[PDB]
Design a protein around this motif. Structure first.
Motif, PDB file in Angstrom:
ATOM      1  N   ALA A   1       0.823  -1.203   0.000  1.00  0.00           N
ATOM      2  CA  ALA A   1       0.000   0.000   0.000  1.00  0.00           C
ATOM      3  C   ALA A   1       0.859   1.256   0.000  1.00  0.00           C
ATOM      4  O   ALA A   1       0.609   2.190  -0.771  1.00  0.00           O
ATOM      5  N   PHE A   2       1.890   1.288   0.845  1.00  0.00           N
ATOM      6  CA  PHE A   2       2.809   2.419   0.846  1.00  0.00           C
ATOM      7  C   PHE A   2       3.480   2.574  -0.509  1.00  0.00           C
ATOM      8  O   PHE A   2       3.678   3.701  -0.979  1.00  0.00           O
TER       9      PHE A   2
ATOM     10  N   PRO B   1      -0.511  -5.572 -11.894  1.00  0.00           N
ATOM     11  CA  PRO B   1      -0.835  -6.613 -12.879  1.00  0.00           C
ATOM     12  C   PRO B   1       0.405  -7.355 -13.353  1.00  0.00           C
ATOM     13  O   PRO B   1       1.484  -6.780 -13.505  1.00  0.00           O
TER      14      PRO B   1
ATOM     15  N   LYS C   1      -5.666  -8.528 -17.597  1.00  0.00           N
ATOM     16  CA  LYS C   1      -6.271  -7.641 -18.588  1.00  0.00           C
ATOM     17  C   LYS C   1      -5.518  -7.734 -19.912  1.00  0.00           C
ATOM     18  O   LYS C   1      -5.243  -6.723 -20.566  1.00  0.00           O
TER      19      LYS C   1
ATOM     20  N   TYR D   1     -18.906 -10.215 -24.166  1.00  0.00           N
ATOM     21  CA  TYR D   1     -17.812 -10.879 -24.872  1.00  0.00           C
ATOM     22  C   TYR D   1     -17.626 -12.294 -24.352  1.00  0.00           C
ATOM     23  O   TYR D   1     -17.514 -13.243 -25.136  1.00  0.00           O
TER      24      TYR D   1
END
Lengths: 108, 117, 121, 160, 49, 199, 51, 422
Positions: free
Chosen positions: H221-222, H268, H306, H377
């Motif tokens: 997170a940092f 990702p 993605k 899709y």
RNA sequence: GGAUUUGGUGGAUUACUAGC
């Protein structure tokens, strides 16, 4: 490398934007008034600018030269907004609509 | 691409190459050879400098001029760049780009750089 | 929201926010319940505005009770976020207050609006 | 108000912008529009996005694909503190650009559907001035921004 | 039809998710003690959702 | 600068083929010099760029940065066939005589092609040629027995013997044009130079 | 915390005092108590001294 | 270097030489039970007497402690001095001390450990020599009254410099500084070894894991904004989870699951890593609770994907493992619950995976599609493959029924797939 | 993205003939 190649991905990154500046469109022919409106041609590589200079300046945006295709001055017709138009059925038809603080509108 | 003799002696040379680099080479000893920095000084006015965020090395030096009458007091160098409308300065003592940029003021590329004694 | 009463219709909610946004521009506007509560204590408040959608609503239900005691007009608006943006802030507002200032440049409108609010009451 | 121009412009739906006050502009994105015109009938597509500007600078985003008299906004952008003067979506509807002519460099690009504003660009040194006009290329990811000084500055989105 | 139509269709189909900021799991230290780890993971998912 | 990135007349000089950039995509168009055509081949990839253009006697051979060569028929407005070398290096120059076709890559690699057969005949690299921005094949008879190459200097090479024959002192800047005016007399020109050397 | 606690105390009180049909549960107080504890935790977490 | 600088190095090396009375006061004064004045007043044997009883209580709680009575807590250990030993003897002493700290890690709340460790501090001076080992055992007790005392009597190593402020301080180390110590790349390498030793030894316990995962998550997170350092966090932190998944303890496995999920959302990553990730996730998946956590995780790891193949079928080996550890009825129950997370692309990869490899399972695909709304899709691709099945596979009542389901919903798109394919 | 300050190291501050 543990980061996916963004070239394959068509979803842009959420927080990081990859952008590069190019040559200005109005450098070839500057405008003497502000740029009230801008419009990109649906198919052709053209940009239109209009403003209180009463001039409809059209530029061929290539990103490197951006030369001016043509200009049209409309005396007494301030340009508050201008836009391209192509008939959805007749692709051959191309028209330009411009208007301002007047009780008339011009079609080209 | 260009070479110059730095001093009345044969101690230090000034060289430029198509790799967009300017180097100080010392005939007297190799270790003395060093590369001048292209870190730009902060402008006097106080505004932001106009340039690409990605740091890129200055274009090739077509021409260069040297003087040592005034070394150590301010910029003593001019260089001209290809397809480019102003001249950049260098300080041999600082081995760093100068704080002055010189424009042709006539929409022309720089072709000649010269110094007063 | 049966407790919120009287609740201004759609029509009145335009004008009430119209005076509020201008009163904000003139620094004639107090925002927050306690600040509105504070104004009523001094009796400097022309009238009070309230958001009916606040949950739990009771936190602002004490403002009406002062206003009746002090004979101050008050009204409810449906949306708090509209009130907050009308106040000119990035946060929702439940309550707001207008000073008594007879030298204000917006004076006539403020008397105009409360004349409906007292009518609505 | 929603009017059906193919049925004599009869009202078909009515709803209010949540927290809406001092509204300035509205725009749709994700489909065909003035900025992204179609070339044939089959290319016609529906817009999945809608933004509502305001004088305060708040921009409420609504998901058009997902009807009620009172719809909740997906996000309420508030980075700009002045009246929103230009609202425009990317041809694909992935990016929303909000601008204000009140103050200098009042231009922000919003990633969609994350509704997160990009941080790297614009910068303090990014020359925008009195932003007054914005345009997105139908293709190629080119951005044109005009100013009160009459300069149109061009950028290219390397993703496209 | 065209493939780019399918691509843009894929783009519009994708939906938002709650991004993670610096101050999203800081409170985790607060309730850090005598908690079943399954509940900890479920609550991490809650914050993620 | 000029909008037209590259241009070339046909050998008859009656048609000019030119390439220009529309937005971020290059488009190739042909016009009748003697006397409008609204049809342009559009490069679907922004990265793809034309490095070389050569008329054929009625297709135009277009070498790309991608590392493949394109034989384009103007009327069909489509590329008939795609010549692809094993490597991906950009093609630097292209030249032709009849079926013969010779190209050079950024890896300084020669390749020989046959238009009729649609095949890569041979590929090889000659030492002492670090860079090669120009390929020109000398008009000797009906066969290619020698080839002229220049990057900053100019060198003559034999195909069968596959080694240099003679070297000329060229320009300081890269050579831009290496046309052969006549036998034993070829002109040379370089980028950013006012001088053309007859060798 | 005194300022923050007082603000939430008024919120809880105005519910307690005036609510027509208040459930005797303290839910508004409990959730308010959670917020102030979160306010305390981040506030005490801050360290003025450089590490 | 100046003479003082070299001299300072000598001082650190001979810190425990016990040179004179003044030094010996400092060394003996350090204590974990008693204050300085009383500590200087005590002798070794009195300390050993209490510790020997302390170990016995620990032995009753946990048998493995009894071993240290033979080597560290022996009566003859009183005469053992570390300064007199050779390096070969010291490492053996160190190794025994290393093991003792690991077992003592989970019983710090118990008083007898604190007394038992006093002998190690007083006799062998673990606080100055085995400084890093002691802290790494007691990090999760940072708010505990024991931990602050550790700081007072000890010299922080270079890596623990963040805690220098709170040494001999009224306030305990705060939540935030734990993150700062963990943000340092080198410390993760150091702790990587420490957690590695515990996993080998099956000494890990819930307070560690939940403290680790919860510190490890906060590092993400940092560091979310800057991609490059996140990239440096991949070669190390993912290696942590693979080890945790290898642990037979269900506790470690879910601890890894919390780690994987946050990385993917934060950063990702390749499908290859994701496909490898689930395979390791599934390799040692036995516990029911981990089974629940894993299935949630596996969906999330695809949720972050993605790129092309976002919904492509799982590989053959990958498909076989998933069904074995998650029966179809299990995922149906997963698909039944209303609070299900988004798994549209994982199921889409699964439906295609079923489509390619299993002929019997088609009729479940019908139920799977009804339970979850698939994106159009994902519908289109499922339509696409099913068209091939009809041409290749024999027509079936379920197969036409799957078509008929698509006939009922979005008729036009079915024709579009047919138009493009046949 | 811009500006201020600062720690460390590297090369010179003597004319380049190998180490121990």
């Amino acid at each position: 490398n543990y980061k996916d190649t963004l070239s394959n991905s068509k979803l842009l990154p959420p927080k990081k934007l990859d952008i590069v500046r190019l040559k200005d469109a109005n450098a070839s022919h500057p405008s003497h008034s502000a740029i009230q409106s801008l419009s990109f041609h649906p198919s052709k590589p053209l940009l239109l600018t209009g403003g209180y200079d009463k001039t409809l300046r059209i530029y061929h945006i290539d990103g490197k030269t951006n030369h001016l295709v043509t200009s049209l001055h409309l005396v007494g017709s301030p340009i508050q907004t201008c836009t391209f138009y192509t008939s959805l059925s007749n692709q051959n038809q191309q028209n330009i609509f411009t208007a301002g603080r007047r009780r008339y509108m011009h079609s080209w | 691409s260009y070479i110059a003799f730095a001093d009345s002696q044969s101690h230090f040379m000034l060289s430029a190459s198509k790799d967009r680099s300017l180097w100080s080479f010392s005939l007297r000893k190799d270790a003395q050879s060093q590369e001048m920095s292209q870190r730009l000084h902060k402008k006097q006015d106080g505004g932001r400098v106009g340039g690409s965020t990605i740091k890129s090395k200055f274009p090739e030096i077509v021409a260069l001029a040297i003087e040592n009458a005034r070394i150590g007091e301010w910029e003593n160098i001019i260089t001209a760049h290809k397809d480019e409308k102003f001249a950049r300065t260098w300080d041999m003592r600082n081995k760093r780009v100068g704080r002055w940029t010189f424009d042709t003021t006539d929409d022309g590329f720089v072709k000649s750089v010269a110094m007063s004694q | 929201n049966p407790k919120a009463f009287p609740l201004a219709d759609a029509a009145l909610t335009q004008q009430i926010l119209d005076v509020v946004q201008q009163a904000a521009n003139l620094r004639q506007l107090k925002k927050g319940a306690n600040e509105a509560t504070k104004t009523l204590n001094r009796g400097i408040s022309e009238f009070i505005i309230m958001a009916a959608d606040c949950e739990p609503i009771e936190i602002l239900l004490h403002l009406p009770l002062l206003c009746e005691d002090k004979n101050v007009p008050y009204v409810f608006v449906p949306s708090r976020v509209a009130l907050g943006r009308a106040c000119g802030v990035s946060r929702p507002v439940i309550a707001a207050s207008i000073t008594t200032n007879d030298a204000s440049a917006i004076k006539t409108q403020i008397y105009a609006v409360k004349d409906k609010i007292e009518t609505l009451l | 108000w929603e009017f059906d121009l193919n049925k004599n412009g009869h009202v078909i739906r009515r709803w209010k912008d949540q927290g809406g006050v001092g509204i300035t502009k509205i725009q749709v994105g994700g489909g065909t529009t003035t900025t992204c015109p179609a070339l044939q009938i089959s290319k016609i597509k529906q817009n999945r996005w809608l933004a509502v500007g305001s004088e305060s600078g708040f921009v409420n985003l609504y998901d058009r694909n997902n009807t009620s008299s009172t719809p909740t906004p997906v996000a309420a952008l508030d980075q700009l503190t002045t009246t929103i003067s230009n609202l425009q979506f990317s041809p694909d509807g992935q990016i929303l650009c909000m601008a204000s002519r009140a103050v200098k460099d009042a231009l922000r690009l919003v990633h969609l559907p994350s509704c997160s504003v990009f941080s790297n660009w614009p910068t303090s040194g990014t020359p925008l001035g009195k932003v007054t006009s914005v345009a997105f290329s139908p293709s190629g990811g080119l951005l044109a921004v005009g100013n009160e000084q009459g300069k149109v500055r061009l950028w290219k989105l390397n993703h496209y | 039809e065209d493939e780019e139509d399918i691509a843009l269709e894929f783009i519009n189909g994708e939906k938002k998710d709650k991004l993670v900021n610096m101050n999203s799991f800081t409170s985790m230290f607060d309730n850090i003690q005598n908690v079943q780890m399954d509940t900890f993971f479920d609550r991490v998912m809650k914050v993620l959702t | 600068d000029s909008p037209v990135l590259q241009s070339a007349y046909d050998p008859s000089g009656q048609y000019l083929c030119y390439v220009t950039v529309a937005l971020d995509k290059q488009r190739v168009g042909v016009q009748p010099t003697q006397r409008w055509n609204e049809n342009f081949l559009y490069l679907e990839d922004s990265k793809l760029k034309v490095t070389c253009l050569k008329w054929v006697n009625v297709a135009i051979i277009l070498g790309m940065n991608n590392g493949e060569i394109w034989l384009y028929s103007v009327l069909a407005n489509e590329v008939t066939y795609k010549f692809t070398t094993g490597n991906s290096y950009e093609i630097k120059d292209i030249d032709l005589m009849g079926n013969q076709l010779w190209c050079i890559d950024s890896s300084d690699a020669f390749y020989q092609f046959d238009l009729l057969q649609f095949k890569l005949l041979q590929h090889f690299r000659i030492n002492n040629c670090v860079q090669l921005n120009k390929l020109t094949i000398v008009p000797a008879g009906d066969s290619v027995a020698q080839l002229l190459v220049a990057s900053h200097s100019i060198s003559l090479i034999d195909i069968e013997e596959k080694k240099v024959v003679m070297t000329f002192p060229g320009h300081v800047s890269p050579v831009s044009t290496l046309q052969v005016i006549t036998n034993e007399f070829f002109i040379s020109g370089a980028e950013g130079d006012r001088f053309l050397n007859v060798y | 915390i005194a300022r923050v606690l007082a603000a939430k105390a008024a919120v809880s009180l105005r519910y307690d005092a005036l609510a027509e049909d208040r459930d005797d549960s303290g839910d508004i107080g409990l959730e308010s108590r959670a917020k102030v504890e979160n306010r305390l935790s981040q506030l005490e977490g801050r360290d003025l001294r450089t590490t | 270097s100046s003479l003082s600088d070299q001299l300072a190095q000598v001082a650190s090396n001979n810190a425990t030489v016990a040179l004179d009375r003044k030094r010996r006061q400092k060394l003996h004064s350090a204590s974990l039970i008693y204050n300085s004045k009383t500590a200087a007043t005590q002798d070794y044997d009195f300390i050993f007497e209490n510790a020997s009883k302390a170990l016995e209580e620990l032995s009753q709680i946990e048998p493995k402690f009894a071993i240290f009575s033979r080597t560290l807590f022996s009566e003859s250990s009183i005469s053992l001095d570390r300064n007199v030993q050779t390096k070969e003897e010291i490492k053996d002493l160190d190794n025994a001390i290393n093991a003792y700290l690991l077992l003592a890690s989970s019983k710090w709340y118990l008083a007898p450990t604190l007394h038992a460790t006093e002998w190690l501090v007083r006799r062998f001076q673990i606080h100055v020599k085995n400084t890093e080992m002691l802290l790494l055992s007691t990090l999760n007790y940072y708010q505990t009254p024991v931990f602050k005392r550790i700081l007072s009597i000890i010299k922080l190593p270079p890596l623990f410099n963040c805690l220098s402020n709170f040494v001999r301080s009224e306030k305990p180390p705060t939540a935030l500084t734990m993150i700062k110590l963990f943000n340092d790349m080198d410390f993760l390498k150091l702790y990587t070894s420490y957690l590695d030793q515990c996993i080998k030894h099956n000494a890990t316990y819930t307070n560690q894991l939940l403290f680790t995962t919860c510190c490890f998550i906060n590092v993400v997170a940092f560091n979310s904004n800057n991609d490059e350092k996140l990239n440096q966090l991949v070669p190390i932190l993912l290696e942590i989870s693979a080890k945790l998944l290898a642990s037979k303890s269900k506790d470690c496995q879910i601890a890894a699951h919390t780690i994987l999920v946050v990385f993917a959302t934060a950063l990702p990553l390749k499908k290859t890593i994701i496909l490898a990730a689930m395979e390791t996730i599934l390799s040692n998946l036995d516990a029911k609770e981990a089974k629940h956590s894993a299935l949630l995780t596996i969906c999330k790891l695809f949720q972050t994907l993605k790129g092309q193949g976002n919904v492509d079928q799982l590989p053959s080996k990958i498909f076989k493992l998933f069904d074995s550890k998650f029966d179809t009825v299990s995922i149906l129950t997963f698909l039944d619950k209303e609070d299900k997370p988004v798994c549209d692309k994982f199921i889409t990869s699964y439906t295609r995976s079923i489509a390619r490899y299993d002929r019997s399972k088609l009729n479940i695909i019908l139920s799977l599609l009804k339970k979850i709304r698939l994106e159009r899709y994902e519908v289109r691709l499922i339509i696409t493959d099913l068209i091939y099945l009809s041409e290749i596979l024999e027509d079936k009542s379920q197969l036409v029924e799957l078509f008929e389901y698509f006939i009922s919903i979005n008729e036009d798109l079915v024709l579009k797939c047919l138009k493009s394919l046949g």
